[PDB]
Amino acid sequence: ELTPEQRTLQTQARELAQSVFASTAVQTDLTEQYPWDNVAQLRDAGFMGMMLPTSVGGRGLSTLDTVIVIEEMAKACATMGRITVDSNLGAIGAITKYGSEEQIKLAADLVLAGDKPAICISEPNAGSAASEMTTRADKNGDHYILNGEKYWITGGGVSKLHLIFARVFDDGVEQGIGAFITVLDDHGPEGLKVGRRLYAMGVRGIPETHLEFHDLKIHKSMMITFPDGLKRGFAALMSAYNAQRVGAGAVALGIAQCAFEEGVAYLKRREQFGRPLAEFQGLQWMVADMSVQLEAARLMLRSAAVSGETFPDINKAAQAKIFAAETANKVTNDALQFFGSSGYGRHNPMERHVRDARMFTIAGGTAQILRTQVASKILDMKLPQTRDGY
Amino acid sequence: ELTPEQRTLQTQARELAQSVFASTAVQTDLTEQYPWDNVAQLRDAGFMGMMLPTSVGGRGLSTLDTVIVIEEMAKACATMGRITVDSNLGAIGAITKYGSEEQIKLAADLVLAGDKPAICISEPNAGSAASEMTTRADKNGDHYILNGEKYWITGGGVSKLHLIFARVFDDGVEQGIGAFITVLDDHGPEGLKVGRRLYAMGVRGIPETHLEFHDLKIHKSMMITFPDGLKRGFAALMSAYNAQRVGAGAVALGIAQCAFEEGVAYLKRREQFGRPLAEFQGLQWMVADMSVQLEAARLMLRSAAVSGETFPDINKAAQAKIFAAETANKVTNDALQFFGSSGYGRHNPMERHVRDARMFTIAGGTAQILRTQVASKILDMKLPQTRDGYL
Amino acid sequence: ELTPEQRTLQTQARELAQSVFASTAVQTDLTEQYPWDNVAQLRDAGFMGMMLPTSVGGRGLSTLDTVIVIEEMAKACATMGRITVDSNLGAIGAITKYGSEEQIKLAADLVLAGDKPAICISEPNAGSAASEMTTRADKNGDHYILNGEKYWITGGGVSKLHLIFARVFDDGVEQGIGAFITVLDDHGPEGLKVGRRLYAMGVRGIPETHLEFHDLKIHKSMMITFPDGLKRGFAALMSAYNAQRVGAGAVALGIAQCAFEEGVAYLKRREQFGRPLAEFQGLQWMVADMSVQLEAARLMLRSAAVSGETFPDINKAAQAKIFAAETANKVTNDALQFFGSSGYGRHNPMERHVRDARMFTIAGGTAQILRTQVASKILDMKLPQTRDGYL
Amino acid sequence: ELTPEQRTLQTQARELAQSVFASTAVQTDLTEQYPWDNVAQLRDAGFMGMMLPTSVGGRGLSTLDTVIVIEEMAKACATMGRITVDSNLGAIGAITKYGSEEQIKLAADLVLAGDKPAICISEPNAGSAASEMTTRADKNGDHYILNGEKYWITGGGVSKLHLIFARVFDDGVEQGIGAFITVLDDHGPEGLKVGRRLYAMGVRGIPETHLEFHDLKIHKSMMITFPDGLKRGFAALMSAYNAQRVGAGAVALGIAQCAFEEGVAYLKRREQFGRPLAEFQGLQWMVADMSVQLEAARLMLRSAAVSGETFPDINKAAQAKIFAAETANKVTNDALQFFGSSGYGRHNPMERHVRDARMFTIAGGTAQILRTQVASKILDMKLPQTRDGY
Ligand SMILES: Cc1cc2nc3c(=O)[nH]c(=O)nc-3n(C[C@H](O)[C@H](O)[C@H](O)COP(=O)(O)OP(=O)(O)OC[C@H]3O[C@@H](n4cnc5c(N)ncnc54)[C@H](O)[C@@H]3O)c2cc1C
Ligand SMILES: Cc1cc2nc3c(=O)[nH]c(=O)nc-3n(C[C@H](O)[C@H](O)[C@H](O)COP(=O)(O)OP(=O)(O)OC[C@H]3O[C@@H](n4cnc5c(N)ncnc54)[C@H](O)[C@@H]3O)c2cc1C
Ligand SMILES: Cc1cc2nc3c(=O)[nH]c(=O)nc-3n(C[C@H](O)[C@H](O)[C@H](O)COP(=O)(O)OP(=O)(O)OC[C@H]3O[C@@H](n4cnc5c(N)ncnc54)[C@H](O)[C@@H]3O)c2cc1C
Numbered sequence A, D: 001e002l003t004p005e006q007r008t009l010q011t012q013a014r015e016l017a018q019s020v021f022a023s024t025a026v027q028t029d030l031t032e033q034y035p036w037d038n039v040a041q042l043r044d045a046g047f048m049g050m051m052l053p054t055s056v057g058g059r060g061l062s063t064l065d066t067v068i069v070i071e072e073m074a075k076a077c078a079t080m081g082r083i084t085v086d087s088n089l090g091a092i093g094a095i096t097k098y099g100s101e102e103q104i105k106l107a108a109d110l111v112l113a114g115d116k117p118a119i120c121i122s123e124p125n126a127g128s129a130a131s132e133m134t135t136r137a138d139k140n141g142d143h144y145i146l147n148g149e150k151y152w153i154t155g156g157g158v159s160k161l162h163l164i165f166a167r168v169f170d171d172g173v174e175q176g177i178g179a180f181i182t183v184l185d186d187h188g189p190e191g192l193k194v195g196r197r198l199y200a201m202g203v204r205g206i207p208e209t210h211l212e213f214h215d216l217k218i219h220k221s222m223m224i225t226f227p228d229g230l231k232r233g234f235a236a237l238m239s240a241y242n243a244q245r246v247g248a249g250a251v252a253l254g255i256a257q258c259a260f261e262e263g264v265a266y267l268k269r270r271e272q273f274g275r276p277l278a279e280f281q282g283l284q285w286m287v288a289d290m291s292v293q294l295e296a297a298r299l300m301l302r303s304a305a306v307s308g309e310t311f312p313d314i315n316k317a318a319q320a321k322i323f324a325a326e327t328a329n330k331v332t333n334d335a336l337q338f339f340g341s342s343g344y345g346r347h348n349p350m351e352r353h354v355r356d357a358r359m360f361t362i363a364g365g366t367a368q369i370l371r372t373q374v375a376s377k378i379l380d381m382k383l384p385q386t387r388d389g390y
Numbered sequence B, C: 001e002l003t004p005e006q007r008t009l010q011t012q013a014r015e016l017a018q019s020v021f022a023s024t025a026v027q028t029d030l031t032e033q034y035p036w037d038n039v040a041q042l043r044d045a046g047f048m049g050m051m052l053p054t055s056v057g058g059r060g061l062s063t064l065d066t067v068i069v070i071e072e073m074a075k076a077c078a079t080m081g082r083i084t085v086d087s088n089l090g091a092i093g094a095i096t097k098y099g100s101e102e103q104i105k106l107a108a109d110l111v112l113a114g115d116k117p118a119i120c121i122s123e124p125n126a127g128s129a130a131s132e133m134t135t136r137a138d139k140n141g142d143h144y145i146l147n148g149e150k151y152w153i154t155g156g157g158v159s160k161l162h163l164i165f166a167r168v169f170d171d172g173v174e175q176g177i178g179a180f181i182t183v184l185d186d187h188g189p190e191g192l193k194v195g196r197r198l199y200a201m202g203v204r205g206i207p208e209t210h211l212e213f214h215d216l217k218i219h220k221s222m223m224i225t226f227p228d229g230l231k232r233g234f235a236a237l238m239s240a241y242n243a244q245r246v247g248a249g250a251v252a253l254g255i256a257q258c259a260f261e262e263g264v265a266y267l268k269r270r271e272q273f274g275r276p277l278a279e280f281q282g283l284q285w286m287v288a289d290m291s292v293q294l295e296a297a298r299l300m301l302r303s304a305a306v307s308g309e310t311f312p313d314i315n316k317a318a319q320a321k322i323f324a325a326e327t328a329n330k331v332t333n334d335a336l337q338f339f340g341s342s343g344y345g346r347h348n349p350m351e352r353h354v355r356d357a358r359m360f361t362i363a364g365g366t367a368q369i370l371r372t373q374v375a376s377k378i379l380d381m382k383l384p385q386t387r388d389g390y391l
């Protein structure tokens, strides 16, 4: 259960979400435009960069704290939910833990001022097999020259801070995969080019784009550097996604919780056969089932949030994300069902919840990849996926 | 299994669907516009009014014949699938079976000319409890005067032939629920007004609208009349809907079958970890599960199509529609999953398949109402839904 | 997560369960005999009456403490699991909280000496509708005279302490449902008769019996009495059952956890096609699914255990029991599947796990009745089940 | 739908099942003894060896015919269901199609006289990977000498006709896997030894045993011989199991149909809260769901039954068996649930239905193996399961 302090934080997040964000969710989905007005208020209320240390102007809060807040934001608007995830977990967490003092201040100043960082890993031919990426960074003096292409970049065209993963070469000699920090300004940098938008089924208020690097010049001071090498550093950087996974799970949970509350209210108001739909036992049991799965999902995510060291344990986070994301797909569809034909109408928000929830078994590591991860832990086995793995 | 003649019919439907309709499905979803040119080609290829008797210029085909055709159309475009349903089953079937010679000719001439009839039953405050409808038909001489409002009317603003269900009153005295034929054109009729469009999650190429009746005047020769009471006639009219349900189940099935085929093809061409996704056993079993459920759904629908007398048996139809629609929701979602992030992009058709499939556990009697229907048969009892049902 | 002290308690429970109980589970299922020697060891290790206050010789532990212990016992033997539930939660909790000093001492002395109390509520014609019970308690001076019949009484013929629920009448006038304490020994009491044994699919090591009352005479000092009415007291008594439900959910979970562990171990040692079954991705994902659901169930149960005041919150308890029991039915069946044909042989414990797990969606309030309970909370309304409930 | 002739056959099977077999099912499960009395009447009513050609005294009926009959038998008693499968499909089908005139008459005379043949393939270390079997047959003159061990032999100790699969060696040179016919008599043959009984969760009325061969001498005339070789013959012999799979599916379906009918009757008779349980919508929808899955299962099996040439198409049969067996596990458990605590009692038959149904996702090819088979057809791919398959 939550501490008094956590309850206060939850209430503050709920108040902003309900009083400001909830009434914007339809228009944000309709226009597919980044809600700058909401982001400013998310910032002003202290909900961006929450886990940044107080030494750089952060609140020094926990993963659990952010998950509590994320769920409240997502209940109002899926876009605001994901904005809250990206401005608190993931790239910013990786920079916070492995970044130089300089890199941390840069990233913190941007996030605390309202930037939602973009992480740039995935490519058209490199998804679940991320290490197959072709984006490369070639050494040139005290700089690295980046060439390549990413896609489905959440925040493409609106994010300023970018964390880019690239295969690193020193004078033609492959060093491994490294991460590079760059800042998209109204002016530069030269060679960081936003590409075409990938219009999506849901969470449409955040642009997802291709992203290209044409001789993008990055100083070595903006490469995340590791003493024991890049190959070990890249795995260390990946551990940041364990936190982002729990946050993403909390967005799916928030969407589902919203749909559930709306469906339950509708069952009590809507009448057929002379009585509220709530009086029909078949629907009552559907409500019960949604409630049970939602509670389990919340427990899985909050439990995962406090596991591990700096980041959630990889297997607890994987278990919770599988569960939350599948829960959200079932709950949003069944809540839509409570509305009947009105649920199929775009003038009601139920079909949007289904569209919004659907990405969470996919993005950031698919439910399938997560199942393999969980199995590798239970079976205490490496589970190589290549033809010659065994 | 299918007859030789049915295989030919299936292949001719597939031919039109794949050569003409498939390349239009994305744009139809984008524009949300009724695909008039496609409808002309559906008509010209002989796939509208197929069960109409040959005497009025129909092909005299069976329910099974139509569901075979519908699944092929729906594999190409969900909108063309539903158009094929409404122009072959439901309202047109009710008229074909219970209509007078004059009513059948009127309806046949319109459908064979390319009209997709609209059926007008549901109201904002009367959906599952269709018997609580407030749309009213008051006898006035040899006419009935209609007042009321329907909604989610498929074809609102593009359909010409309408079949409107209303509570019938004679001198204030309720007679039962009756069905009234009218034809919308640019001239009239007076008092038939197309209301607002209800924009939808999917199958966006047919407009769904509110529909208002303001002293709409219908002659008694355009009412479907039964020699012994509307109270048994309404039940008879709703049997024509057993046929519509199998057709709608076939649309859901076609959508899912398309998604399945696309998903399977993607697994074989897409590589990660140095090999096609098809080589992963977890995905192989997902593929097997989809195939098993698709096959079952297809059997359920065809079995229902040949059941009953004039129309499919109400309970076999309900069972098949439950099964097919739930199958489609699972298969379209799982096929989308095979595509990864690309599956979430609207530049691919997988997210549309999910949106399209989702209406079929809802329209024409929800999966919940169908479960109650099937239970009433198995338990062999009336299952009243009112508070005083058992008193 | 668990406290250091709770980890020690868990490990001590595991120690007893694995070193002593695990090797007896097969034989307990074969004989269907109450495992007296095992019960003595459960007692001597301090795992009976754990929530009893220290003043009467208990350990004063929490609900969470008990569910941690119960899951360990159930992993070894379902019978020892249920024995641990009944000797820590439910009847003994009702008495501990609402009993007089005299009643608590009587009950505490019996439990700490190794007695597993029986709770006596359900009747052949009154299960889910517990409020329709026909077992009757008629006031006669300072006594109540009990007449009636219970069944599926866990511990029938071996339990000494009984807590019997009966409809209370004073001069023919119904007062509500009340709870009455009695102790069965070889001497008496007169009119308490153990009826026939109901042989069961699983958890066969505790006898389940009919129980008859024939003018069973109970002094009013052995009735659980409430300062303001049985009509609120019965509701209070049934709150003690919220605790029993979490315990029973923990038994279901322990059974499933055991089956899971055995299944996983088998996959790693069993080879077909030249390699361990563990290397097949289809089975790897089955393993992942089981783990995810087990983890959720464990969280649900522990969350419920710390909810509420004296006893777990009725709705968190209902939710957790729904989840845990359904999880166990799926996990035990799927773990059995990992064994192939060996899993169907009674010389392996997998088929027993399925049989054992299956009671937990039924006993103490079925999964259906629990769904209604949870719905009543979410919808915040009474959900009467009678024909006239809404009139 | 069924033809008039098929309906008549169905009625005749139902009449025997209901008037004779149904009242025996509890005792057969309780004693775990082979019901000789029922078998005699199954024989006398013409329900054994139904697909044997009329030239050898059979009825020349179809796979669909047998599936219709099997379901009716299984509705009365799971044991009688499996007896009907084994005396009509499987080993007897393989002998009927690939056997010599001599082998066919032998097998037909035995089955028509009431023998339930035993097929002997599986071994402790050879299950899904059946070709890994170690039972061997070594050439010796005009005979073969068999040594090895099988298990889970359905009919061990009561079956007379045995069809044994063994790895064949000619003077030490491996020839492939072949099938051998032998007949267990009260006297011989020497070296055919019934082993220990494997007591089972359900379908307890048929003994499942280990089986051993100690220098079991079989004349070459009782080996099933193929002109194009054993390696191609063994695959041909396997095709017989496609028919047995559909029959086994019909047993699972029959068990489930029985449980469903009993559950529905109980909902109408049992009252709580002043009314029949049948009036509760939650249960009504459970009934509806069972009905839908049962109908689909029946269609899948009957459709599979008429597919293929001599035997059902391997993929249609695999699809139908997966479906029927999983359907039966869900339906029997939910029907048990309708009975409440009484359902858990062994004095009612509901817990037996669950135990009986459970074997059918396992025996004769597990649901997992069948999923791989179905996938291999959809993907048009061989799906090798060995480490070096790719
Ligand atoms: C809304 C959205 C936002 C995104 N935002 C970002 C972002 O900001 N930054 C970024 O870098 N990326 C982003 N992505 C990309 C996403 O994280 C990756 O694409 C993800 O890894 C999925 O990869 P993929 O699409 O190539 O799937 P694939 O790897 O091609 O997989 C396709 C299918 O095959 C399955 N599969 C793959 N491999 C295996 C295997 N060995 N066994 C079994 N099954 C298997 C998958 O589960 C999936 O079902 C985003 C994606 C979405 C949808
Ligand atoms: C895409 C689309 C096209 C349509 N086209 C047409 C058309 O052309 N002509 C026409 O007349 N109508 C049409 N409809 C309307 C549709 O057929 C009806 O609206 C349908 O009966 C559902 O009605 P409802 O939305 O009012 O649901 P409601 O009756 O309000 O029900 C809402 C929810 O409560 C449930 N429910 C209701 N009653 C009960 C009960 N007694 N027990 C348990 N659960 C219950 C429902 O299953 C549903 O989940 C269309 C609808 C859609 C979505
Ligand atoms: C192993 C075991 C041990 C037990 N130990 C004890 C014990 O020690 N003490 C004791 O008092 N009892 C005990 N019981 C009895 C058990 O708690 C009750 O019997 C239970 O309440 C179920 O009652 P029932 O079997 O009469 O079900 P019924 O009430 O007859 O219900 C039968 C079916 O109808 C459903 N149903 C009923 N009512 C409704 C409704 N309004 N809406 C929807 N569905 C509905 C039920 O969910 C169930 O599926 C035990 C039972 C078992 C199996």
Ligand SMILES: Cc1cc2nc3c(=O)[nH]c(=O)nc-3n(C[C@H](O)[C@H](O)[C@H](O)COP(=O)(O)OP(=O)(O)OC[C@H]3O[C@@H](n4cnc5c(N)ncnc54)[C@H](O)[C@@H]3O)c2cc1C
Residues within 6 Å of the ligand: C270, C272, C273, C277, C280, C282, C283, C337, C338, C339, C340, C341, C342, C344, D118, D119, D120, D121, D122, D124, D126, D127, D128, D129, D151, D152, D153, D154, D155, D200, D208, D359, D362, D363, D364, D365, D366, D367, D368, D369, D385
């Ligand atoms: C009631 C009963 C009656 C029987 N009667 C007979 C009979 O009369 N004659 C006879 O010859 N045999 C008989 N058998 C044996 C049965 O047909 C075989 O044992 C069956 O092939 C299962 O093999 P197995 O137990 O060794 O499972 P295994 O092959 O060891 O498999 C164990 C588990 O791993 C899975 N598995 C295996 N391989 C793979 C893979 N590549 N990918 C994914 N998953 C996998 C399986 O699905 C299963 O879940 C009977 C069995 C039973 C239960």
